[PDB]
Fold:
Amino acid sequence: SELLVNTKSGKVMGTRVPVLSSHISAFLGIPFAEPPVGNMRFRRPEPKKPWSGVWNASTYPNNCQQYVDEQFPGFSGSEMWNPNREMSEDCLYLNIWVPSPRPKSTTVMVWIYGGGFYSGSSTLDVYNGKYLAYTEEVVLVSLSYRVGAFGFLALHGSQEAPGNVGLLDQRMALQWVHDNIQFFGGDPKTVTIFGESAGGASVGMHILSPGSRDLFRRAILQSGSPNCPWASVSVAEGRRRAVELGRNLNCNLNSDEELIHCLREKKPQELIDVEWNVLPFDSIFRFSFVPVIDGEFFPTSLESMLNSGNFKKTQILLGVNKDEGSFFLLYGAPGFSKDSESKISREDFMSGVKLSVPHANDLGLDAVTLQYTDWMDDNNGIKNRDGLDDIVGDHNVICPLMHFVNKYTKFGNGTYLYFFNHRASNLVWPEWMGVIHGYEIEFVFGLPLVKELNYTAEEEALSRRIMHYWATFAKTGNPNEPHSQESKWPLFTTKEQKFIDLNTEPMKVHQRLRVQMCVFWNQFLPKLLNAT
Amino acid sequence: SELLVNTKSGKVMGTRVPVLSSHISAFLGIPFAEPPVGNMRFRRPEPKKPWSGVWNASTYPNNCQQYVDEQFPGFSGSEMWNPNREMSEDCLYLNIWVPSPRPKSTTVMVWIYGGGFYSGSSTLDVYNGKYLAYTEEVVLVSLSYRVGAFGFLALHGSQEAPGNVGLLDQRMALQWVHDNIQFFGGDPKTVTIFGESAGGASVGMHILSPGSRDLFRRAILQSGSPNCPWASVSVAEGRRRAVELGRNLNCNLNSDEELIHCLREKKPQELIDVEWNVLPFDSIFRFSFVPVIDGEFFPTSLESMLNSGNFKKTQILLGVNKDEGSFFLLYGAPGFSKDSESKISREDFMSGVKLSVPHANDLGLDAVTLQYTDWMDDNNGIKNRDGLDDIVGDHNVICPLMHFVNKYTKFGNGTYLYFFNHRASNLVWPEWMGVIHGYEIEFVFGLPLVKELNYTAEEEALSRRIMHYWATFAKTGNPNEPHSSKWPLFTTKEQKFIDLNTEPMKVHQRLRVQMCVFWNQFLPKLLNAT
Ligand SMILES: COc1cc(CNC(=O)Cc2cn(CCNc3c4ccccc4nc4cc(Cl)ccc34)nn2)ccc1O
Ligand SMILES: COc1cc(CNC(=O)Cc2cn(CCNc3c4ccccc4nc4cc(Cl)ccc34)nn2)ccc1O
Ligand SMILES: *[C@@H]1O[C@H](CO)[C@@H](O)[C@H](O)[C@H]1NC(C)=O
Ligand SMILES: *[C@@H]1O[C@H](CO)[C@@H](O)[C@H](O)[C@H]1NC(C)=O
Ligand SMILES: *[C@@H]1O[C@H](CO)[C@@H](O)[C@H](O)[C@H]1NC(C)=O
Ligand SMILES: *[C@@H]1O[C@H](CO)[C@@H](O)[C@H](O)[C@H]1NC(C)=O
Ligand SMILES: *[C@@H]1O[C@H](CO)[C@@H](O)[C@H](O)[C@H]1NC(C)=O
Ligand SMILES: *[C@@H]1O[C@H](CO)[C@@H](O)[C@H](O)[C@H]1NC(C)=O
Ligand SMILES: [Cl-]
Ligand SMILES: [Cl-]
Ligand SMILES: [Cl-]
Ligand SMILES: [Cl-]
Ligand SMILES: [Cl-]
Structure:
């Protein structure tokens, strides 16, 4: 039976799903861990105990408990990122799309969703794996992991709330794929992990973490890298935020045990309602409960691991979007609105700079301002708007990724870098937001192939070449088919630093992605902030 | 009669000189101070005592004692700035060119030479006042002042070597003009002082100093301003350099009196031979003996005077050249040569910014480097060279002047700002040096009007335009003649300036505003913080 699969934890029964006038098999909502509920809240995950009978894997699972965005009620542009299933702490499930007929031993791709480590679901429409699995003949897995305080409350020293347990959730799903994907026609020796934003940082963190390295072959990182300023905190700061969470909930704070015991008695929504109150500053692109540099999942500082070559040496493919910052300014900074051009006054520019670089002293804010201000034309609201957009995306996404790219390439086995800069013809968000954080995902997952969604024919072709780059890289470590007639995406090298644009035009090769601003963010500003 | 003038100090006899197929009167080498020689070395100047008989004013005077540039022997481009008369400590003289026939009561312009406060002569070819006096019908005076240690050795608290005596030489010549120019056909109520480089800084210093302000009407500043980083030192640093000069010469250092007595025994060239040894850093565009912020000539810090409005409120006309830095790199920085395009390696670029900003810490040098480096093309030797050129000129001339112009305009009565960016067609220096520090002077003084010097016809028209702007401003406080395109007032809000070149005038705003925010606001804050 094509839909009946016996795994090491028991039998599962999938469902036959239509795709683009054909069909493939889907195994939805397979458990990979014990429910992390009750006295297991904040604890490392435990493997799912084997079950008798047949697991009905015909429907999507629950989503993990998380903040729900109600900024634009009814608006598809925001609501499509919210949970579309019931939320529950019982949420550690994965989904598998398998070509039909079942392949013998084919390439596997495992998707890790983003969402700032505080939101995200495996079940969103834009993460539907059926188009990529069918078009490129890959076995596509999407995992899940605890987000927010449930996944990343860190009281270092405690074994009840150690921190990083959402990362351990991801690892346990990777271990399940390693142990079971052969029963679905996948090769556990050819697993590519890919993810976007926090999922892209996560992918980088598994490259670094010794306990993860042997559970995958190579990696794709989209608009995120492990060294991003929002993607981790120190053990001291994670302790600070966890204690502040208890303080917001009238918890006994005398010891880790009773603080944890207090927090385990609260309903999930009680923690979520105060989650944002524990941040140290008014800020944008900052999130309360994130991975912690603990000495276990990460043996030393990320920078020292990067400098020494202490990471998995393989092939990577990674990149960024042109306007990573716009969504964060819309939600968090003065003068921005989705129903206007959002021309930014000089006063609102100054406010946004402080929100964008909250850890900076006054000298550091001056440096950022001078670097991004045209003093011949300082009251230009369009230049002010775009300058802030660039500040947010450069500081938080692009320049951290370029730092990772350059350190990794010194030891890795092949780097391919992209710059996604296509604005979708059917975008529901205003034109000033440009090429938004997250809006390459629908191209990676082949949604433009669905004629009902009203993408252009050029956008379908773009989606198809991106899916084929991604999958060919997954299968071989090279996005290019050698001996093909197509334009070749060149290796990124330390010396020449090449990358391509991804858009609907013929390929352009460039060098030194945003090198000028990234010298500022990666070398000058940190030296300034460390001055005294 | 026309050439025989009785002044308050005695009779002077000038000479009839040819100018452009005509003639005017020249009175050369008139003394305005007692010779500051012997025990008067380093002291404030004293008025020249009256003489009987007729002072022969037919010949240029001696030049003050100074370092002589021998980098390019026989090269006219460097030797034209060196002394062209015998050097002597007996050098406090001035020169006057008077239209013929003698006007009744006309506008006076007084030239103050530059040269880093360590060199300069009133007698150079490019300062010949006859073309400007004749063409614009003004009385043209050039003064002189002691340079180097002789003018600016500063041992504050001593009255024997107090500092700033070179500035007091300038003021005494202005006092002499105030008292006597009426006998030469000049109006002492309509005196414009103007100078370039250190002379431009000097002009600004006389605007600030209460003891100078009543001795002139208006001012012109060319490629220099009083707040320039090279233009003054603190009394502590001045004292340190004076003590180090004595140390270099095996002087007794126990007391001011003993040090000064030692330094007064040395021959002039003995002091000049060690002058540069007292600088605290390897550097370019830094000079050993310069004005001191003493509490007397300058009542408080320059910045506080500028902020409070404690200065002379009048009209000013001022500006800069496109490539102020190139001359200093040629003489002082690795990789530059007069005989090549001087493409600058990355290594020599780093050495250059260190020499250019000697007071900066490592973080400050990084900031300057980031501000001027194209990291898409960092091994471009042309971009590295031009970046270093901009650094030197922006830091040392352009941005200090813009800080001055913005502060002055808040209280003053009229500001006119120019940007001189014409490369002379007969320039003797290589192309990479561009529009060099000092090379607007020949246009201000009308040398393009001289056929044998082989300027183009367009360059003669430019010089005539510049001479008329300068003199009309001197006469009225406004460079424009009330009838025709206008040079607009620089205002705090609109910040307009004009280019000066052979092309029709264009108005711009915010001269090098991006780099001057860096030099005037961010870098000072960075260095004060780190
Ligand atoms: C600043 O401090 C505080 C902050 C808050 C509240 N902040 C906020 O909600 C910011 C926010 C976060 N998301 C997450 C929604 N999904 C996503 C995306 C998810 C994953 C990956 C890419 C995504 N790309 C999106 C692009 C657009 Cl265009 C819209 C939504 C996107 N939506 N908005 C409350 C209180 C505070 O004190
Ligand atoms: C910090 O200490 C140091 C500082 C420096 C940096 N100062 C120096 O270059 C000064 C200098 C002066 N002359 C001889 C002066 N004639 C002049 C000028 C005179 C007055 C006004 C403008 C002049 N425009 C000239 C242009 C050219 Cl092209 C050639 C000579 C010019 N030659 N050099 C170098 C080394 C150091 O150690
Ligand atoms: C599995 O669940 C699906 C979805 O409701 C249902 O249609 C199907 O009958 C179930 N299979 C069983 C009960 O064997
Ligand atoms: C990857 O490693 C193999 C094995 O040593 C080597 O032959 C190849 O050159 C490497 N490729 C890159 C791009 O480093
Ligand atoms: C897609 O375009 C069709 C044809 O114009 C239109 O009827 C439909 O409403 C569009 N669908 C969406 C989801 O925009
Ligand atoms: C003034 O000096 C010049 C040369 O030094 C001389 O020719 C002239 O006759 C002198 N005038 C006198 C001595 O009256
Ligand atoms: C100069 O001062 C006069 C007299 O007070 C005044 O009328 C005029 O506005 C001033 N001009 C400028 C440019 O400030
Ligand atoms: C000026 O031009 C004349 C005439 O062509 C020429 O003889 C002379 O050499 C030139 N002078 C200089 C100083 O170049
Ligand atoms: Cl479909
Ligand atoms: Cl390489
Ligand atoms: Cl002549
Ligand atoms: Cl040039
Ligand atoms: Cl004004």
